[PDB]
């Protein structure tokens, strides 16, 4: 790596944008059950297999 | 200081010798020096006229 | 049981020939008008090594009769040919070493090599180091020619079948002890994966018919029929005799 | 990048219609053992190459500087 395809990099960018916790205001909504973001993907714990 | 002493001739005995004679100075190196020397002396003499080409040839092959 | 070595050679994945450094196929010139009505002259430019082949090759250059260009051909070098030598090929070419003549045009006792089984195949017989066929008679009726091959077999070929005069170079090769496994290794890593060879007796029964036992033995006659089938043919196949060869063979 | 030895050629180079800028560098060197002289380098920047003329004599230098064109933008060091 570091000499990548654009396809690999494109997916890495979506994973950078997915790796954030909840917006706070979503907990405040009516009929809300989402307490936390389950699909977190730290680089130690779990590899995304590209 | 140790270099100056080794230059004078110190620390060069049998006890300060852990490699072989050939390892320290190869006999092929010694040969090459010797023969280059004799070879260029003969050449300079032949050029200067202190020796003719026939004696040059004899001495070249003897060397 | 399991499929054996000789069986899966035919699938031939890792048993293909190793052909990178081979200069090409050794082929005679295509039999055409000149070579069957007169002669064509060519020049030996290079005498070159061919990997996986003890015999050297000759890069011969001829002219195309029909287009202005030089067509190059790869002959197997007869012993004695040399760079800058003219090579004459055809019906009316002189009897000299390196020349390509028809075996009808040559006389009896003539020694040739790279000789066509039938006209046009561009060389089949007497192609390896030191080998030659002898011509031992003509039948000018029905344009045939009887010849001795290096195996001892007599054969009858068309008189129009071409053959290059002389013996193929590289002779004496198998006199020298190869003398070490590494040299056999380097021999065969330019030919094919036929080396090293393990013995059936040394392996297990799944792996070979000779395999098994509390001693290393075969147990059955190693002479095995021509009508045996694949997997059962792993000894001396269709052996009409066996043992040390004594006395005159080639009985006739 | 290219050294020039002839002042005629250098003057044409100045009057070459694509040379806009130039620079004059004064240096301090010595004449083979003894005394420090004063070296001058006239550098004109064409499109592809920088042409430089080395003049060891301040007299020729002074005449040449006045002999430059007027429209050329000269940077004295």
């Amino acid at each position: 790596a570091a000499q990548k395809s654009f396809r690999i990099k494109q997916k890495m960018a979506k994973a950078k944008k997915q790796n954030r916790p909840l917006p706070q205001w979503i907990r405040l909504r009516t009929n809300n059950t989402i307490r936390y973001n389950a699909k977190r993907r730290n680089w130690r714990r779990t590899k995304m297999n590209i | 200081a140790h270099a100056q002493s080794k230059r004078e001739g110190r620390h060069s005995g049998y006890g300060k010798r852990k490699g072989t004679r050939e390892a320290r100075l190869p006999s092929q190196v010694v040969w090459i020096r010797r023969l280059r020397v004799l070879r260029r002396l003969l050449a300079k003499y032949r050029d200067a006229g202190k020796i003719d080409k026939h004696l040059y040839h004899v001495l070249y092959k003897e060397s | 049981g399991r499929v054996i070595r000789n069986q899966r050679k035919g699938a031939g994945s890792i048993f293909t020939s190793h052909t990178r450094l081979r200069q090409g196929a050794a082929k005679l010139r295509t039999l055409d008008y000149a070579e069957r009505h007169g002669y064509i002259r060519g020049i030996v430019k290079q005498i070159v090594h061919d990997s996986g082949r003890g015999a050297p090759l000759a890069k011969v250059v001829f002219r195309d009769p029909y287009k202005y260009r030089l067509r190059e051909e790869i002959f197997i070098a007869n012993e004695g040919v040399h760079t800058g030598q003219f090579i004459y090929a055809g019906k009316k070419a002189s009897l000299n070493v390196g020349n390509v003549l028809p075996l009808g045009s040559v006389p009896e006792g003539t020694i040739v090599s790279n000789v066509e089984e039938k006209p046009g195949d561009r060389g089949a017989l007497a192609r390896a180091s030191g080998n030659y066929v002898i011509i031992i008679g003509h039948n000018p009726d029905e344009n045939k020619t009887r010849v001795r091959l290096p195996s001892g077999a007599k054969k009858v070929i068309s008189s129009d079948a071409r053959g290059v005069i002389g013996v193929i170079a590289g002779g004496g090769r198998v006199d020298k002890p190869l003398l070490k496994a590494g040299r056999a290794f380097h021999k065969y890593r330019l030919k094919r994966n036929s080396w090293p060879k393990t013995r059936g007796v040394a392996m297990n029964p799944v792996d070979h018919p000779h395999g098994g036992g509390n001693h290393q033995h075969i147990g059955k006659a190693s002479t095995i029929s021509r009508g045996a089938v694949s997997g059962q043919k792993a000894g001396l196949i269709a052996a009409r005799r066996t043992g040390l060869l004594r006395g005159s063979q080639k009985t006739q | 990048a290219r050294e020039i030895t002839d002042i005629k050629q250098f003057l044409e180079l100045t009057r070459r219609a694509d040379v806009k800028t130039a620079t004059v560098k004064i240096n301090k060197k010595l004449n083979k053992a003894g005394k420090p002289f004063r070296q001058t380098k006239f550098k004109v920047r064409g499109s592809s190459s920088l042409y430089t003329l080395v003049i060891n004599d301040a007299g020729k230098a002074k005449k040449l500087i006045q002999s430059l064109p007027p429209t050329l933008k000269v940077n004295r060091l």
Binding site: - | - | H49, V81, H82, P107, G170, L179 | -
Partner: protein, 91 residues
């Protein structure tokens, strides 16, 4: 001085492989590594590469030959035989 009594060139194999094998190899390897006389230039500059190929250092001519000597007895017989046959036809 003479350094080996009988092994010669095959002392590079030392103690290995057996005396008969080393002897056969000796006999052939001498011829192999020898210098031969050019039929063309008359000089003694013919050395082999690549068994069956004998090049002259001067003169740059390359001859097809034997594997460990330039000419085999068979090819000698062949050139003489072919000469006799050619002369039988035209002489």
């Amino acid at each position: 001085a003479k350094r080996t009594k009988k092994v010669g060139i095959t002392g590079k194999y030392g103690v290995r492989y057996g005396s008969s094998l080393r002897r056969q190899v000796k006999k052939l390897e001498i011829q192999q590594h020898a210098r031969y006389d050019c039929s063309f230039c008359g000089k003694k500059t013919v050395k082999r590469g690549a068994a069956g190929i004998w090049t002259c250092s001067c003169c740059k001519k390359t001859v097809a030959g034997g594997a460990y000597t330039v000419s085999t007895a068979a090819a000698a017989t062949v050139r003489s035989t072919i000469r006799r046959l050619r002369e039988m036809v035209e002489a």
